[PDB]
Design a protein around this ligand. Structure first.
Ligand SMILES: [Mg+2]
Ligand SMILES: [Mg+2]
Ligand SMILES: [Mg+2]
Ligand SMILES: [Mg+2]
Ligand SMILES: [Mg+2]
Ligand SMILES: [Mg+2]
Ligand SMILES: [Mg+2]
Ligand SMILES: [Mg+2]
Ligand SMILES: [Mg+2]
Ligand SMILES: [Mg+2]
Ligand SMILES: [Mg+2]
Ligand SMILES: [Mg+2]
Ligand SMILES: [Mg+2]
Ligand SMILES: [Mg+2]
Ligand SMILES: [Mg+2]
Ligand SMILES: [Mg+2]
Ligand SMILES: [Mg+2]
Ligand SMILES: [Mg+2]
Ligand SMILES: [Mg+2]
Ligand SMILES: [Mg+2]
Ligand SMILES: [Mg+2]
Ligand SMILES: [Mg+2]
Ligand SMILES: [Mg+2]
Ligand SMILES: [Mg+2]
Ligand SMILES: [Mg+2]
Ligand SMILES: [Mg+2]
Ligand SMILES: [Mg+2]
Ligand SMILES: [Mg+2]
Ligand SMILES: [Mg+2]
Ligand SMILES: [Mg+2]
Ligand SMILES: [Mg+2]
Ligand SMILES: [Mg+2]
Ligand SMILES: [Mg+2]
Ligand SMILES: [Mg+2]
Ligand SMILES: [Mg+2]
Ligand SMILES: [Mg+2]
Ligand SMILES: [Mg+2]
Ligand SMILES: [Mg+2]
Ligand SMILES: [Mg+2]
Ligand SMILES: [Mg+2]
Ligand SMILES: [Mg+2]
Ligand SMILES: [Mg+2]
Ligand SMILES: [Mg+2]
Ligand SMILES: [Mg+2]
Ligand SMILES: [Mg+2]
Ligand SMILES: [Mg+2]
Ligand SMILES: [Mg+2]
Ligand SMILES: [Mg+2]
Ligand SMILES: [Mg+2]
Ligand SMILES: [Mg+2]
Ligand SMILES: [Mg+2]
Ligand SMILES: [Mg+2]
Ligand SMILES: [Mg+2]
Ligand SMILES: [Mg+2]
Ligand SMILES: [Mg+2]
Ligand SMILES: [Mg+2]
Ligand SMILES: [Mg+2]
Ligand SMILES: [Mg+2]
Ligand SMILES: [Mg+2]
Ligand SMILES: [Mg+2]
Ligand SMILES: [Mg+2]
Ligand SMILES: [Mg+2]
Ligand SMILES: [Mg+2]
Ligand SMILES: [Mg+2]
Ligand SMILES: [Mg+2]
Ligand SMILES: [Mg+2]
Ligand SMILES: [Mg+2]
Ligand SMILES: [Mg+2]
Ligand SMILES: [Mg+2]
Ligand SMILES: [Mg+2]
Ligand SMILES: [Mg+2]
Ligand SMILES: [Mg+2]
Ligand SMILES: [Mg+2]
Ligand SMILES: [Mg+2]
Ligand SMILES: [Mg+2]
Ligand SMILES: [Mg+2]
Ligand SMILES: [Mg+2]
Ligand SMILES: [Mg+2]
Ligand SMILES: [Mg+2]
Ligand SMILES: [Mg+2]
Ligand SMILES: [Mg+2]
Ligand SMILES: [Mg+2]
Ligand SMILES: [Mg+2]
Ligand SMILES: [Mg+2]
Ligand SMILES: [Mg+2]
Ligand SMILES: [Mg+2]
Ligand SMILES: [Mg+2]
Ligand SMILES: [Mg+2]
Ligand SMILES: [Mg+2]
Ligand SMILES: [Mg+2]
Ligand SMILES: [Mg+2]
Ligand SMILES: [Mg+2]
Ligand SMILES: [Mg+2]
Ligand SMILES: [Mg+2]
Ligand SMILES: [Mg+2]
Ligand SMILES: [Mg+2]
Ligand SMILES: [Mg+2]
Lengths: 271, 46, 95
RNA sequence: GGAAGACCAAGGGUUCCUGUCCAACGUUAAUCGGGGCAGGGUGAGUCGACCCCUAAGGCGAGGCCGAAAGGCGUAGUCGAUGGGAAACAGGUUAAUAUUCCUGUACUUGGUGUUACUGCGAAGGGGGGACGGAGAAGGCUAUGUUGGCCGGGCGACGGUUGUCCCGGUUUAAGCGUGUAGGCUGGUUUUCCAGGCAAAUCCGGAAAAUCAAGGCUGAGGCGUGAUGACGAGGCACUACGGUGCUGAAGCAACAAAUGCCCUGCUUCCAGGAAAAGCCUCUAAGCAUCAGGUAACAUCAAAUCGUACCCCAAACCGACACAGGUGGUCAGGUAGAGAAUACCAAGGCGCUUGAGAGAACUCGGGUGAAGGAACUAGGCAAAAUGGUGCCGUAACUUCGGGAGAAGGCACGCUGAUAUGUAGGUGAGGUCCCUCGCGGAUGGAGCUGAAAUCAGUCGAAGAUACCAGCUGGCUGCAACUGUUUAUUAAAAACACAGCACUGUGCAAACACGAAAGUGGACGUAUACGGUGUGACGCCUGCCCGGUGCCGGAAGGUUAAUUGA
RNA sequence: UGGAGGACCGAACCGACUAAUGUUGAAAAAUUAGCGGAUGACUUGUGGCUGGGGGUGAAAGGCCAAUCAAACCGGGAGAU
């Protein structure tokens, strides 16, 4: 339920919030939780290696199963939960034998849905399987790049991958970025899409909101002094140079991808 | 107003205390220099 | 415990108005004891050396004062004080 | 007097208390002191530290890495600001007291007996265990009045009365199980998910019962024939000592404290680990070990004085500055603002005169009312509660407290105190109780209307908006040049470009590694712009970036 | 009925808009009278982390011990 607010105060005005009424109100499933500490975007030298991070509300790490490797054993969806650790929602599911696991919550999923994973599984959303057993052209998420490693691709809300080719050991995917990539057919994937696709709609409306999300302010380079940035001071408002990162590398159009390892896999760039 | 020295014991001793010096090469060089100048007390200890 | 240690515990009777007060009124004596002795060893040592019955021993440590002698700043040594409770039974006296 | 009081933590380290002294110290004298000299003073199983357990973070055997020193990190091992057993009232010192004394308790361990008995962990599972906001019901601390008890008839009119003053205090514990919150219960069979095992956890299936369990403020009872207690009676070195000791209840109001780590709701989704409960593996089986009652022993060590809204800490000073936590009396008041007082603490360590100019901080002002000046700078004025009323414009919320106006004291009646709030006695019921209904004594107590009355003035003090019209810039709350700049600067939600396929770009590291992220293109980084609304036109010649490989050109290399 | 908000008025608390006094100060940045925020991008306690060809910066070249367009201390060093 994507909803605007009546503007009872200037901050509240532009706020669009997304209310999913189907979400579980009340505590997560404890045995599946972990401790998580915010790093302030700082490495083991205490320096800031990534700017604009910190503050933010406290979060607990939900342990989500990306390998989906408990096999041929049906499991049913108990409830949908909010995961602070990621865009998407999650599902708390119960395998027949008495085990519970969290998973990414795919679209069309709701309390009561039977799902299952293995080589044999039926094709319906929320089911997982190695991809040579997947109909070509089908839509999937939570895709592995190496067999048994666990899902990496299309974990965000509303994202998904289309399988456009099966050749020998390699299936070719149309990635969400628009880039054709080969992946070995033995990597499990999951049917449907990631749900809560309306995540992207929601508007913060006020700086404070962004600050809850662990995002600190961003100082425009050309505002700083010439010593701090290449973009540098001037008298009043002055630019004069081609745009660069704070470390001087050219931005706005320069390709920074360099790997020669992973090249044989990539068919074509996104455009 | 609020001046620069706001004392704390635990702070004082973790920062400059004997053991804190001895932890490192540099610190033991401090304690070397002091023992060579012949101080009354090397570090800050009670 | 060994007796050899014992005879080394108890330095001296502590003399003062508080002392006299407790000795008369509550049946308790006051001792300067070695800085390191403990309630066990003082209980033992009185019970042994004065041969009378100790109930309980409470203790404290006195920090010596700081003095000046001829501009020089010295520090009087620390020491340990012990309030030693005797049961109403014994009567210890001064001849 | 929401402190200039009382108690801590920090920090100090003897400044504490007594005697004695007055050179120096104390902005003066000082007989006094936080000064000098001497003595005394800090009493713990249950308050803290230690200790048990972990957070961020640190160190880190092996290990990876690095010219050397060294960097990173695994098993570990440290690290509280967090989690972990238990004590209260009264009495006492010149100075300690939750420690000493009186009484009354409590906890955890060791040994012992006795009765019973499947006990065992670094492994398993529960528990511990967690946000913001809100709501309001139950209470208590506490206070006010009345009853009660002791004393009082009072320097000046009046005061044997509906009169005046003072007291009306009592804890942990132990027994009880209430307002409230949470949750179906019990029995049986199966399943292997819980790294091995499981009778425990989770899962499935029947059977059966409806009350069951868990939690819980406070009340009541005991604790307590005790203590405390106004005072009185004896002695006193006039500092005190000893004896005796009345009443010791009730109604009402009431927290920000407790019930409540609860309940309702929101999204930004809200520590870890041990004690603690249970399940078993290796094991051990009449041993061991566990459970209960009685006896018995132990509970070590260190801190404890005094100062902490400061003359004792941080400011060179006995410095108009700075310093976290706790307690929270009265009348008025929305109130922890304010004004005046209580408990309690102080009069700020040079006075004494005089009553000029001038400076400082104020008070008042004829007539005028911004004519002052860079500028209404400063001053004055506004100021409260209820009711009436309120524009352009608008993003429909606002603007708006717009503007402007009206009543406001006291006394009486409606009512010798109403509406409400609380709810005794009685009668009835009861699954009999801290129960239910009825019941209305007492107690508390707004608001209004009408009639009167005082004053120049009733929001009489302190307290407590100046308002309106036009326009620049910035949407907005925020942030900033500690110490001359708070803005029109910065950020901002949003918008766009662009980079990045995960061993991500990028960043920090000669490297290992780490952050990005236990994220995954609805993600992440970088640059610009900066809500919303309307829009974002032309130019690729210049520099840049992206694509192209044909030719021309060119490095090491090879050596004709 | 409900109780949203970088909502409103307003003390503690946080801050520093104006004026005067102070300028060998009561103070090496204060006081007095007014002023802004005051449920949050708030505020504060204890502990930890980042180290100078560096940090950190809602960005003023601000901040890093009353010293910052490159801290402090010892050295080269009797620099020139
Ligand atoms: Mg670390
Ligand atoms: Mg960023
Ligand atoms: Mg995150
Ligand atoms: Mg931005
Ligand atoms: Mg600038
Ligand atoms: Mg810099
Ligand atoms: Mg530059
Ligand atoms: Mg500029
Ligand atoms: Mg210009
Ligand atoms: Mg004792
Ligand atoms: Mg002790
Ligand atoms: Mg000595
Ligand atoms: Mg006041
Ligand atoms: Mg401190
Ligand atoms: Mg201390
Ligand atoms: Mg002294
Ligand atoms: Mg004194
Ligand atoms: Mg004296
Ligand atoms: Mg003098
Ligand atoms: Mg004099
Ligand atoms: Mg004299
Ligand atoms: Mg003295
Ligand atoms: Mg304790
Ligand atoms: Mg650690
Ligand atoms: Mg090593
Ligand atoms: Mg290390
Ligand atoms: Mg430890
Ligand atoms: Mg410690
Ligand atoms: Mg602690
Ligand atoms: Mg503790
Ligand atoms: Mg005292
Ligand atoms: Mg456990
Ligand atoms: Mg906690
Ligand atoms: Mg909640
Ligand atoms: Mg009461
Ligand atoms: Mg009478
Ligand atoms: Mg109940
Ligand atoms: Mg008496
Ligand atoms: Mg409160
Ligand atoms: Mg409080
Ligand atoms: Mg004490
Ligand atoms: Mg004390
Ligand atoms: Mg203070
Ligand atoms: Mg005080
Ligand atoms: Mg001082
Ligand atoms: Mg003075
Ligand atoms: Mg002072
Ligand atoms: Mg303060
Ligand atoms: Mg008051
Ligand atoms: Mg009132
Ligand atoms: Mg007064
Ligand atoms: Mg008084
Ligand atoms: Mg005082
Ligand atoms: Mg004047
Ligand atoms: Mg005037
Ligand atoms: Mg006039
Ligand atoms: Mg006039
Ligand atoms: Mg006029
Ligand atoms: Mg003139
Ligand atoms: Mg003029
Ligand atoms: Mg003015
Ligand atoms: Mg005025
Ligand atoms: Mg206007
Ligand atoms: Mg009347
Ligand atoms: Mg009445
Ligand atoms: Mg009534
Ligand atoms: Mg009623
Ligand atoms: Mg009149
Ligand atoms: Mg009138
Ligand atoms: Mg103009
Ligand atoms: Mg602005
Ligand atoms: Mg604009
Ligand atoms: Mg502002
Ligand atoms: Mg400034
Ligand atoms: Mg200023
Ligand atoms: Mg590099
Ligand atoms: Mg690397
Ligand atoms: Mg991480
Ligand atoms: Mg982006
Ligand atoms: Mg701009
Ligand atoms: Mg071009
Ligand atoms: Mg071109
Ligand atoms: Mg090119
Ligand atoms: Mg402050
Ligand atoms: Mg500031
Ligand atoms: Mg002020
Ligand atoms: Mg204010
Ligand atoms: Mg405002
Ligand atoms: Mg305000
Ligand atoms: Mg904090
Ligand atoms: Mg800042
Ligand atoms: Mg400085
Ligand atoms: Mg430098
Ligand atoms: Mg330089
Ligand atoms: Mg030279
Ligand atoms: Mg020279
Ligand atoms: Mg020369």
């Amino acid at each position: 339920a994507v909803v605007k607010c009546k503007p009872t105060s200037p901050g509240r005005r532009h706020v669009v919030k997304v209310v999913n009424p189907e979400l579980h109100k009340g505590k997560p499933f404890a045995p599946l939780l972990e401790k998580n500490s915010k790093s302030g975007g700082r490495n083991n030298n205490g320096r800031i290696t990534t700017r604009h991070i910190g503050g933010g509300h406290k979060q607990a790490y939900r342990i989500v199963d990306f390998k989906r490797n408990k096999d041929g054993i049906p499991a049913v969806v108990e409830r949908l939960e909010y995961d602070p650790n990621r865009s998407a929602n999650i599902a708390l599911v119960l395998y027949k034998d008495g085990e519970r696991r969290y998973i990414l919550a795919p679209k069309g999923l709701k309390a009561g849905d039977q799902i299952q994973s293995g080589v044999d599984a039926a094709i319906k959303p929320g089911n997982t399987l190695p991809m040579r057993n997947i109909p070509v052209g089908s839509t999937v998420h939570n895709v592995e790049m190496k067999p048994g490693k666990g899902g990496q691709l299309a974990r965000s809300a509303g994202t998904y991958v289309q399988i456009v080719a099966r050749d020998g050991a390699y299936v070719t995917l149309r990635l969400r970025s628009g880039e054709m990539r080969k992946v070995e057919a033995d990597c499990r994937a999951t049917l449907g899409e990631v749900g809560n696709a309306e995540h992207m709609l929601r508007v913060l409306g006020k700086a404070g909101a962004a600050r809850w999300r662990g995002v600190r302010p961003t100082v425009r380079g050309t505002a700083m002094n010439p010593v701090d940035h290449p973009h540098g001071g001037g008298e009043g408002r002055n630019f004069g140079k081609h745009p660069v990162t704070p470390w001087g590398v050219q931005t706005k159009g320069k390709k920074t991808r360099s790997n020669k390892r992973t090249d044989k896999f990539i068919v074509r760039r996104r455009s | 107003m609020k001046r620069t020295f706001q004392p704390s014991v635990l702070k004082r001793n973790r920062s400059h205390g004997f053991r804190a010096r001895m932890a490192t090469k540099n610190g033991r060089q401090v304690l070397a220099r002091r023992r060579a100048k012949g101080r009354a007390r090397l570090t800050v200890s009670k | 415990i060994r007796e050899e240690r014992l005879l080394k515990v108890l330095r001296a009777p502590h003399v003062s108005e508080k002392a006299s007060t407790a000795m008369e009124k509550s049946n308790t004596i006051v001792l300067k004891v070695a800085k390191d002795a403990t309630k066990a060893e003082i209980k033992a040592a009185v019970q042994k050396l004065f041969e009378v019955e100790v109930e309980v021993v409470n203790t404290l440590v006195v920090k010596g004062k700081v003095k000046r002698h001829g501009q020089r700043i010295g520090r009087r040594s620390d020491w340990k004080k012990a309030y030693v409770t005797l049961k109403e039974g014994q009567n210890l006296d001064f001849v």
